[PDB]
């Protein structure tokens, strides 16, 4: 009766919101494995609270701490990169892939190959290994469920088994901190101001690279022609995305910013479940605004568009190059508007062959990073 | 392959939009029967255009004209109230119930009793005979699909087979022409200032149209009254919403083109192309929301109570309203009187819940005489 559950990256924000829903219904779920990287405390605590079968700490050096933290406990202990992959293969009917970056690609792909249900929080997967990821889903009949806000909104409004019914998919975007800033002023932006907030996430938001990546991710998740995707600027961020059908009918997913709504969706799918998420009060909201994205002020959107259009290792290169360029800006080595410049340069000087395995992906990423760092230190 | 189709009230706005989609895909549809009241021209035309099996003119007086208009045609001709009910029994897999008011209750119920698919445009149905209509739906396993904007929007965001997944249903409302007018100024409004003739226009101004929609929604979705909410949204681009237990709210948005919801009901469970326009959010710019003023539009309160009370309540209110409105238009009463009359009648007439359409026709007729009486007291 209990549905077995595993969470890769159980100690981050997603991992937390996830366990929050699992522990509220501990009677419906049987936790198999929980993972963390260096936060042995939360990991062992979470493991013990849910009476998980295994707890894995990524960092091999923290192996003895986990083992000691779980002393007298029935939870098994493990550490290292391989242990993550092994935990992803333990057989959980529902797996939350919350380990981000190249570090979670192996585990995520392993979980997918198991053919059960995989809630994807690791969006980066699709940008660098989208093609492979989708092949494995097709091959193993895996149920892939997007956890991220935009893709989850789209999924809830999407006609699965009938892509042909979609006229367009609108990915709403807040616009970022510089939604009303001129290119001229953006040139003088400092890492301090750019990150000001409610690290890299902040900067991808400011350059709108996060929307370029989300578009790429959506492209692989929904298998729809690129010309059917649109980015719509909507400051309030209350509408999380929309899908227009052939009869002109447009379905939209709206709600508060509580991550437990989408996570709750992916956790209960195909059924729905209660989550303490707040009920959007349209009266206090009063207003909703919409405008077109400025492709001239945010060229990253263009770089993203072309990469997918071109295909192959393009998006991988772009994303890798962005990592370098953003870190440079933060390290005050470059100017804000240079980030998109470096990414564009790299995309033009490095165009490897499409990946066939994760090993190729890891390679391209590493190469792109080296190429980018080079160009980055030219001007 | 071609799906048999029948349209009751094929000559109105709804029927027109419906035939528009049918004729654009005439290859997948085989029209069985088309119906009209007195517009023999459009009816014969539509009948001939779609190579319909039969054409039915409601007014028995116009029988010869129709028979004339379809001369040399393979379309059979028929007229009279009974002919309508008979046409609704011909067996069409998909039926558009576009006949308005008590005049279409018989045909609509007969179509529903055939157990296939019935696109409901006759909102009336549910207000006056909601209980009966839904019983027949359950008894014959009929697929009932709401055609009006608000209910169709809700249906597309609704978790059928799981009503307990819904936390609330929000019925958006433009707010009507007097959304920003004071009770004081509404008191002196003239019937001319409230048609942009049109009755619907008045129900819009008094917000009775939204009370009625809430009643119809209650019957269509079978969810506790306390779960329905009315939200004023001037732009009217969001047609209605449904909040789920996980906080997630699904909303149906789009252009005002009726072919969208009609296209939805025509293709369900599949989707189909319709010339409907793609809402351009860039040109829309903004969307506004505010709570409905229950004090400035008591009609909303009369509606709530009626459903709350139940039985013949809504039926009486709706009937009472019909008279009160016609009175205002005939300049016999003031604008703010309309809600007064309906209020009075509901209190002086409380028959027993209907058991058949015969009871319904009765209550309506009674409420109408009761209302007309009270109407001419002040
Ligand atoms: O973003 P957050 O650090 O908010 O969450 C990251 C999540 O990823 C896990 N994680 C972070 N880095 C790695 C890594 N290199 N390998 C495996 N898991 C990792 C975290 O472990 P823990 O919280 O230590 O970071 C945590 O569960
Ligand atoms: O609103 P509209 O008059 O716009 O459309 C009403 C629709 O209802 C039909 N109709 C009107 N009155 C009756 C009646 N008494 N019985 C059956 N059908 C009717 C109309 O016939 P048509 O418009 O001829 O009246 C038309 O198809």
From Swiss-Prot, chain B:
Family matches, as HAMAP family: DXP_reductoisom (MF_00183)
Activity over temperature: Optimum temperature is 50-60 degrees Celsius.
Protein name as catalogued: 1-deoxy-D-xylulose 5-phosphate reductoisomerase
Subunit description: Homodimer.
Notes on how activity is controlled: Competitively inhibited by the antibiotic fosmidomycin.
EC number: 1.1.1.267
Catalytic activity of the protein: 2-C-methyl-D-erythritol 4-phosphate + NADP(+) = 1-deoxy-D-xylulose 5-phosphate + NADPH + H(+)
